[PDB]
Amino acid sequence: GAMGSMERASLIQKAKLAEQAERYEDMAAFMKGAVEKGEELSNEERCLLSVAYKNVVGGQRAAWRVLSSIEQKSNEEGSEEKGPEVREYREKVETELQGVCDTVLGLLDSHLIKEAGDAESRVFYLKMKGDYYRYLAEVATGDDKKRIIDSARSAYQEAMDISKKEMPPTNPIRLGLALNFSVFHYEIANSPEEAISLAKTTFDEAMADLHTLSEDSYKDSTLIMQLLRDNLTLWT
């Protein structure tokens, strides 16, 4: 690992600088180096890791969607043969995206999840595992497609099971997990009714628990609740 010689604290400090500079690839490399020190992550450190990789893969997914759309139109009836270039470049971006997902899934499996015993860490990491299998599922076409989809479902489901037993319905990790699992149902599993039901039940159970919160906790919970409502509005 190219970060093996840097102090853990220096990697975390530089990840924060990279975030301020919007250098998300650097941020992700710094956080990968920090994870590879072998120590458990704090709440803030898990946030840095997830923000870094979400921004890297988010850019790759956006580029992949542009290229896939161009490829789909180049294959329609009446379109002119442009050669292999659109497919090749879509494949190049796809392979890079898959590489980033495999890296994140590798950090989670070696060994973040197995050492995560508190709900707030274990649910967070299982949510990430579902997210990165979901990104793989977005591009999957081969023999293992259904197993990729089920790996996302399984990770999200274990996270849901722990969050329902161990976290209040307003916990932002629990809310974000439900938001993303609902999107998995809608976009990956072809299950829009399950997506809508999960978003609605999550929103309503959080609403009923807001009265227990401080103003700062209320702001965090209602932010994610608004995203659930936004998706419900898109879908209904």
């Binding site: 974000g176 938001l179 993303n180 999107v183 659930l228 936004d230």
Partner: peptide, 6 residues
Amino acid sequence: GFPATV
């Protein structure tokens, strides 16, 4: 288009 995820 991206529905909202966090």
